[PDB]
Amino acid sequence: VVLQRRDWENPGVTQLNRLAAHPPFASWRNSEEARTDRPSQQLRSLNGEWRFAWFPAPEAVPESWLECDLPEADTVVVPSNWQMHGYDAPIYTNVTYPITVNPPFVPTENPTGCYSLTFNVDESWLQEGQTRIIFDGVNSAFHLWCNGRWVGYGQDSRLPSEFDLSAFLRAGENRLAVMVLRWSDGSYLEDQDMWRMSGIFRDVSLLHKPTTQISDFHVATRFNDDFSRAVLEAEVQMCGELRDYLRVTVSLWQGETQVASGTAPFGGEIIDERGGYADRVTLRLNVENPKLWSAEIPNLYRAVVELHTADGTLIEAEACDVGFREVRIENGLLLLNGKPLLIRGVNRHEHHPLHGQVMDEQTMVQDILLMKQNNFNAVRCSHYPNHPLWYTLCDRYGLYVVDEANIETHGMVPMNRLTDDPRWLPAMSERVTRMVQRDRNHPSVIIWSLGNESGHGANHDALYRWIKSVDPSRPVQYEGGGADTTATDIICPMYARVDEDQPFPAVPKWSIKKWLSLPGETRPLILCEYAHAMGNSLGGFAKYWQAFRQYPRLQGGFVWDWVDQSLIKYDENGNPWSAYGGDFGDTPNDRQFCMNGLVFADRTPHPALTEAKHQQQFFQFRLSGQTIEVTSEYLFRHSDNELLHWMVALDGKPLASGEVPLDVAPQGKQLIELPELPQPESAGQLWLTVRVVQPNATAWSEAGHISAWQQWRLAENLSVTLPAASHAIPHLTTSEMDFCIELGNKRWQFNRQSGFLSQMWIGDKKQLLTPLRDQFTRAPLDNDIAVSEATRIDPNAWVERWKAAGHYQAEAALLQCTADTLADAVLITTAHAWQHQGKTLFISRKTYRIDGSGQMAITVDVEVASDTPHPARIGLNCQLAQVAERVNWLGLGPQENYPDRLTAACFDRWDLPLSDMYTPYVFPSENGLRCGTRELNYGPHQWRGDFQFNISRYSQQQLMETSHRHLLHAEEGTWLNIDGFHMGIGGDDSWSPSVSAEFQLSAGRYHYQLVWCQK
C-alpha cells in the first residue's frame, strides 16, 4: 500500500493521519509549573542516539526493518541532517531545482533515510489519556511506523508533524520506524537558495494529554487610543467529552503578581442560525496601564490557561508569554504601539557549519546577541517557519519577526506556474495555515509572509485573504510578482536601489523613493532583502539609511543576510576548512553564492557588520560650533543606560576628552555644550570623536558596550613652516642600464629599460623583492564577478569588461626615463603607456624627487582612456622584503574600509598585527583596504600623503587565482598596494553592476603624491 500509493509524488496528499496544528503545548498538570515555564513530565524528548540506515530508494528498504533493527544500521545523533554524517552529499544550488522539473514526480533514485528508535513507555501513559509523537522537522517527507504498524505520513520540512500513538504503543519496550524521503512533491515548494539536505533535523518528542484536553488557544490584545487600557482576549478550544462541570480559567501574571483572571464554562456566543461553538469559550481580561512589548523594551506577561472542574480540580494547564503590542498600518505607515517603526532588519537562515540545518539554543542566543549588539531590531525567517525556540527567544530578547511560510518555487518557468495552479492550493494552504496556527501567539511575530520567490499566483491572493480573516492583528507581506501586488500590505522589494530604477519587464524594481509615489500607491515600503553582503560588500549601505531617515514611508529593510552558508570539510591532516557549492561532488552547483553573510559561519564578523552597526545607530548627531545635538531614534525608551564620551585629537594625539550623561526622551533631542578647547601648538587637523557607551550590562550586552559613534573635522592649521634645509646632497650615478642615487647607507636603483624603481638599499640589505610598478586592477570581488547562477555570465559585469578590455593582460611600455640633478635633490622622470592589442588604456607620468633628508617624493599623474572600462584602482604596488609584526597608520580604521563603505571607520592612529590587515573571505579577493590614510608605517618604512592601502603576504595575483582561503600561501616578504584612488565595491546586489557612479574611477585624469622615507 505504502509502495503502491507513492504519496511523495502526489501534491494532493501532504499528510495521512496527522493531528491538527496548534500553539506550543506542554500539558502541565501543575499550574505553578505552567506559570513559571518549568519542564513538564508530560513532555518528553526523544532526542539522542537513534539507529540509521541509508538506501538509494524506498523500494530498496527491506520489510524486516519494520519489525527489527538492521544489523547494517549505524547509531547516530538525532536531530541531524544525514549529509552531515557523510551518507550522501549536500547539494548547493540557487534557482535550478536539484531534481528534474517534472511535477509532481521526483527521481526514482530517491535517497531514503531509515531511522528507528527503541524506547520505553510507562503504563501510566497508556492507561489513560492520549500519547502523541511530535516531529518538529523532517526533510522532506516521511512515513511513520510504530511497533511494525503504519501510523501516518507527513510533508512540509519546516513545521511539526504530530501523530496519535495511543493505540500503537505497549507498556515497556517500543520501536519507531521512520522512513524519510529526500525528495517529494513537497520539494517543488522548497526551492530556497540554500544547501539541499534531509533527515530528522529538528526535535522529536512525546506529549501526553488527557482525553479531555485544551486543543487550541488564541491570545489577542486590543487597546484604547493612548494604550493606557488593554483588553486581553483568550479563545480556548477543547477536545473530549463535554460536561456541565467543566471550566476554563485564564490568568495573567506580571512577574509573580496576578493582574487579572477570568473563569467560564464552555459554550461560545451564537455565531449563526445553528447556534455557537459548544466546545469553545472566550475569556476577556481588562488590563490597566499594561507594560507594552517592543524590541526596545520586551515587557512580557504570562498567560496561564487551565482546564478544570467547577469544584477546583485541575485537568491540565497550558501557557504562553504575552506581549502587549499593536501592529497596524495607518495612513501608509507601519505602526507599533502607535509609533512608526524603523526596521533595522536582517534575513537569517538556520545554518550551522558543522551541524548543517540543525539549530541549537547556544547558536540562536549567539546570533540574537550579536544582532542586538549590532543595532538590529528585526529578523526575517528566510524562508520557512523556524525552530520553535527562535520565537521564544525573540519574544524575550526583543526582536521583530517576519514569520514566513515554507513556500519557494523559484525554479519554475514562469515562477508562478505552481502558485497560479488550483491543484497546488491545498499544499500551499497547509504551509500558510499551519504556520499561523503554531505561531500566532508570539508577540515577536509582527508580520506574516506568504513565502519567497514563487511569482504571484491566484493561490497567493486566496491565502493572503485567509490570514487577514483569521488574524487581523498582523500585516501580511509577499514579494513575488513585483513586490507591490494585491497579496501584500507592504511594498517589499528585494534589491531595489535608492535612486536608480531597474525597469525589468513585468517585475520592475523602481528606485525606492520613486516607488512610494507611483500614481495610486499609498503603502509603506520595507525591503524584504537589500544590501547583498556577499564577500567584500555592503558598498552604498549609508545611501539606504540616509533615505530611510528622510522618507517617512521608507521604513527600512532586511539585509541579505546574516550568516555565510559555508560547511566544514577536513584536509588529510584533519584540519578544518570552509567549503561551499561544488566541494562535496555536488553537481550542478552555484559555488560561493551560498555565502552572503555579515558573519562567517562560525559567527566571526565580516568587516561589513561594523558598517551595518554604525548606519543602524539609534542616536543621531549634529555639530554646531561648541554644541553637539543628540537626537534619539527610539520610540519608547528614554536613554536610561547611555553616556556620551567625547574626544578631541590632533592627528591621533589626544588633546581633550570628557563625558556627559545622556538624558533623551524617545524621539527627543539633547544639547551638549563642549568646553573651551585649548588651541594646539602644532600644525594639523583636529578631529572630534563622540561615542555612546552603555555603563550597565543588559540581557544582550556587556558593561561598556559602545552603541553609537560619530566624527567631525574641527579647526585645521596648515603647515607653513618649511623643514630646516638638510646639509647632505644625494649623488646620481648614471650607467647605460640604471640611474643610481646614493645618500649614505641608502641607494635607490631605477632600471632604465623598464622605468621603475627596481630596488632600494639600506646598507647591503635589499628592500624590494618586486619593483614598484603601477597597478590598475584588483583581484575581483564577488560583486565584480557578478554571478548568481554559475551557468550565466553578465557581459556587463565589471570583471567581464576589465578582462575584455585587457586590463589584467596590459603590458607597460616605457616612453620616457630621464634623470636630473637639482641643487639639493635628484629628480627622476618617467612615462609609461599601458597597452592592449594596439590600444592605449592608461598613461602614467611620474617624478621621483630624492633630497638630502632621504625622502623620496613620488608624483603620479595618470590618464585613463575614456572608452576603456573604469579601472578598479589607480595606484602602485611592490613586494617588500621585510616581514614585520605590526602595521601602524594614521587614517580610517581600524577595520577594512572602502570608498563606498567607510562611514563606520574613524580617523585616528591605529596599530594592528599584520594578520588583521587581511580579511579571510572564504572566496579570496581584494581585501583589507584602509582609506583616507595620511601616514603608513611598516618595519623601517614610512609613506605619507592621502591614499588608500592594503598590506599582506598575498599578491593580487594569488588572490585572483585561488578559489578558497585555506589554499592561500604566505609569499616571500610583504605585498603592498598603495592607491591614490580605488573603485567602490558595490553590493546593492551581487549579480549585475552595482557600483554607484560617484564611486567609479571615471575622471579621465588622476593625480596623487606619496613620500617614501625610512622611519
Ligand X SMILES: OC[C@H]1O[C@@H](OC[C@H]2O[C@@H](O)[C@H](O)[C@@H](O)[C@@H]2O)[C@H](O)[C@@H](O)[C@H]1O
177 makes contact with ligand X (CB under 6 A): no
State whether the Cα torsion 593-598-603-605 is positive or negative.
positive
Residues 422-451 that bind a second copy (CB under 8 A): 422-427, 429-431, 433-435, 437-441
Q: Which is nearer to Na ion, 268 or 340 (CB)?
A: 340
193 is in an annotated binding site: yes
Q: Which of 529, 611, 800, 935 is catalytic?
A: 529
The kind and range of the H/E element at 709 are strand 705-717
Buried b (16+ CB within 10 A) or exposed e, 586-617: beebbbbbbbbbbbbbebebbbbbbbbbbbbb
244 is in an annotated binding site: no
Q: Report whether 381 contacts 375 (CB < 8 A).
A: no
Taking the complex as a whole, the smallest distance from the CB of residue 105 to a second copy amounts, in Å, to 14
Nearer to Na ion among residue 654 and residue 661 (C-beta): 661
Residue type, 358: V
CB 16 within 8 A of CB 6: no
Query: Rule CB under 5 A: which of 156-215 touch Mg ion?
Result: 185, 193
Decide if residue 404 touches ligand X (CB under 6 A). Answer: no
Q: What is the CA radius of gyration of the chain?
A: 33
Contact characters 429-458, ligand X, x per CB under 6 A: -----------------------xx-----
- Partners of 1007 in the β-ladder: 861
Angle, helices 361-373 vs 388-397, to 10°: value is 40
Which residue do the cell numbers 566624527 mark?
711
Q: Which does 877 bind (CB under 5 to 8 A by kind): a second copy, Mg ion, Na ion, none?
A: none
783 touches ligand X by CB under 6 A: no
| Binding of ligand X by 190 (CB under 6 A) | no
- Site membership for Na ion, residue 593 (CB under 5 A): yes
Strand, coil or helix: what is 821? strand
Of 560, 634, 910, 1008, the one binding ligand X (CB under 6 A) is: 560
Q: Select from Mg ion, ligand X, a second copy, none the partner in contact with residue 494, using the beta carbon and a kind-dependent cut-off of 5 to 8 Å.
A: ligand X
* Binds ligand X (CB under 6 A): choice among 596, 670, 783, 996: 596
- Which CB, 52 or 495, lies closer to ligand X? 495
Show Cβ contacts of residue 199 under 8 Å, excluding neighbours closer than 6 positions: 79, 80, 81, 82, 83, 113, 115, 138, 139, 180
* Least separation in angstroms between CB 866 and a second copy: 52
Shortest spacing between CB 347 and ligand X, in angstroms:
7
Q: Give just the sign of the alpha carbon dihedral 596, 599, 603, 604.
A: positive
The CB-of-101 to a second copy minimum distance in angstroms stands at 7
Determine if 955 is a binding residue for Mg ion (CB under 5 A): no
Residue 781 binds ligand X (CB under 6 A): no
Minimal distance in Å, beta carbon 7 to Mg ion? Answer: 5
185 binds, among a second copy, ligand X, Mg ion, none (CB under 5 to 8 A by kind): Mg ion
Q: According to CB under 5 A, which one of 252, 554, 628, 799 is a site residue for Na ion?
A: 554
Short-list 493, 447, 442, CA closest to 335: 447
662 binds Na ion (CB under 5 A): yes
Among 116-124, 380-388, 644-652, 941-949, the segment contacting a second copy (CB under 8 A): 380-388
Per-residue CA distances from 82 to 40, 75, 76, 566 (Å):
30, 12, 9, 17
- Is residue 93 involved in binding ligand X (CB under 6 A)? no
Q: Which does 76 bind (CB under 5 to 8 A by kind): Na ion, a second copy, Mg ion, none?
A: none
C-alpha–C-alpha distance, residues 715 and 688, integer Å:
10
The item of ligand X, Na ion, a second copy, none sharing an interface with residue 529, based on CB under 5 to 8 Å by kind, is ligand X
Under rule CB under 6 A, residue 991 binds ligand X: yes
Q: Does 193 bind ligand X (CB under 6 A)?
A: yes
For the chain, the distance separating the N- and C-terminal CA atoms, rounded to the nearest angstrom, is 83
| 635 binding Na ion? (CB under 5 A) | no
* Site residue total, Mg ion (CB under 5 A): 7
Residue identified by cell 520501536 is: 175
Residue 572 annotated in active site: no
Can residue 100 be called a binding residue for a second copy (CB under 8 A)?
no
Beta-sheet pairing, 825-836 with 811-821: antiparallel
Q: Which three cell numbers stand for residue 672?
A: 551638549
Which 8-state DSSP code applies to residue 189?
G
- When the beta carbons of 367 and 529 are compared against ligand X, the nearer one is 529
Please name which of 926, 940, 892, 898 lies closest in space to residue 912, comparing C-alpha atoms: 892
| Closest CB 425 distance from a second copy, rounded Å | 5
Binding status of residue 564 toward ligand X by CB under 6 A:
no
453 is catalytic: yes
- Annotated catalytic residue, options 350, 430, 453, 479: 453
453 is annotated as contributing to ligand binding: yes
**191 binds Na ion per the rule CB under 5 A:** no
Q: What is the DSSP string of 57-122?
A: SGGGS-GGGGTS--TT-EEEEES--GGGGTSS--EEESSS-SS---TT---SS--EEEEEEEEEE-
Give the position of cell 539609511: 545
Q: Binder to Na ion among 367, 479, 642, 979 (CB under 5 A)?
A: 642
Q: Does 13 bind Mg ion (CB under 5 A)?
A: yes
Q: How far is the CB of 194 from ligand X (least distance, A)?
A: 7
For residue 861, give the amino acid letter.
D
Phi, psi of 500 (to 5 degrees): -90, 125
In the complex, the smallest distance separating the C-beta of residue 869 from Na ion, rounded to whole angstroms, is 19
Name which of 429 and 962 has its Cβ closer to a second copy: 429
- Calpha distance 133→164 (Å, rounded): 7
Listing DSSP states for 397-449 in one string gives HT-EEEEE-S-B-TTSSSTTTTTT-GGGHHHHHHHHHHHHHHHTT-TTEEEEE
**Residue 835, beta-bridge partner list:** 811, 840
Closer to ligand X at the Cβ: 33 or 529?
529
Contact window for a second copy (CB under 8 A) among 307-315, 505-513, 600-608, 847-855: 505-513
Quick one: which of 788, 879, 942, 962 contacts ligand X (CB under 6 A)?
A: 788
Provide the minimum distance between the beta carbon of 11 and Mg ion in the complex, in angstroms, as a whole number: 6
Binds ligand X by CB under 6 A, chosen from 164, 789, 861, 916: 789
Neighbours of 279 (CB within 10 A): 16
Beta bridge partners of 219: 234
- Residue 639: CB minimum distance to Mg ion, A: 33
CB neighbour list of residue 540: distance below 8 Å, 6 or more residues apart: 498, 531, 900, 901, 984, 986, 987, 988, 994, 996, 999
**Binding-site member from 6, 10, 666, 845 for Mg ion (CB under 5 A):** 10
Q: Which residues contact 814 (CB under 8 A, 6 or more apart)?
A: 753, 754, 755, 830, 831, 832
Residue 18: left if φ>0, alpha if ψ -120 to 50, beta else—which one?
beta
State the minimum distance, in angstroms, from the CB of residue 455 to Mg ion: 12
- When CB distances are held under 5 to 8 angstroms depending on the partner's kind, the choice from Mg ion, a second copy, Na ion, none that residue 554 binds is Na ion
Q: What angle do CA 801, 804, 805 make, to 5 degrees?
A: 85
Does residue 159 touch a second copy according to CB under 8 A?
yes
1014 burial via Cβ count (<10 Å: 0-12, 13-18, 19+)? middle
Q: Which residue has the cell 521604513?
A: 555
Pick from 494, 498, 538, 559 the residue near ligand X by CB under 6 A.
Answer: 494
* Residues designated catalytic: 453, 529
Binding-site residue ranges for substrate: 94, 193, 453, 529-532, 596, 991
- Interacting residue ranges for ligand X, rule: CB under 6 A: 94-95, 192-193, 382, 452-453, 494-495, 529, 560, 596, 788-789, 991
Binding-site residue ranges: 94, 193, 408, 410, 453, 529-532, 589, 593, 596, 991
- Interacting residue ranges for Mg ion, rule: CB under 5 A: 7, 10, 13, 185, 193, 410, 453
Binding-site residue ranges for Na(+): 193, 593, 596
